[PDB]
């Protein structure tokens, strides 16, 4: 029932994420964002898509909050400047494996 890809292993029931096998704590919104990313590994998700699903439907703010959350997740799990959390300009973010 766990959602995993490469080095990320998220267990919803126990509510924990593993990045090479040590405890690491995230804020919730970031946690459900990571859950949305992992459940759709290899498929790019649009910015309004993420805003409507992982944030509330009536989010009246500005977009860059999602980019701040993505930066949080990247600096949390993706240490190097070559990342597994890829970004496609104008289309959004995705969690594939680099080729």
């Amino acid at each position: 029932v766990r959602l995993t890809f490469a080095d990320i292993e998220l267990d919803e029931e126990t509510h924990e994420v593993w990045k090479a096998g040590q405890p690491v704590s995230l804020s919730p919104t970031e946690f459900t964002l990571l859950r949305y990313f992992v459940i759709n590994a290899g498929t790019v998700l649009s910015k309004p898509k993420i805003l409507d699903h992982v944030w509330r439907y009536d989010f009246g703010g500005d977009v860059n909050v999602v980019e701040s959350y993505v930066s949080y997740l990247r600096r949390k799990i993706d240490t190097g400047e070559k990342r597994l959390l890829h970004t496609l300009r104008g289309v959004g973010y995705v969690l594939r494996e680099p080729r």
């Binding site: 509330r56 439907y57 009536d58 009246g60």
Partner: protein, 87 residues
């Protein structure tokens, strides 16, 4: 024509609208209104927790609790079975 109306899903949608209206009426008026303005059924905009709190004179935490309770009791077997076929 991808954008053309199929003329059958429209009938399905209006019957779903009527059935959802009836199901919401089965519940209490307070919870039905909370759900309606939370999901934007009367109008296009789905209102926020602060908006429903300021229009109903109730604390946002209490409104969250009553919304969760309404959702749990709306997941009830007969309502779920009735709405299942519309998918």
């Amino acid at each position: 024509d991808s954008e053309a109306v199929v003329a059958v899903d429209a009938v399905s949608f209006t019957l779903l609208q009527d059935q959802l209206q009836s199901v919401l009426d089965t519940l209490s008026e307070r919870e039905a209104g909370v759900v309606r303005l939370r999901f934007g059924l009367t109008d296009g905009q789905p209102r926020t927790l602060d908006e429903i709190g300021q229009v109903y004179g109730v604390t946002r935490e209490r409104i969250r609790q009553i919304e969760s309770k309404t959702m749990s009791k709306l997941r009830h077997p007969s309502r779920s079975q009735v709405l299942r076929d519309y998918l």
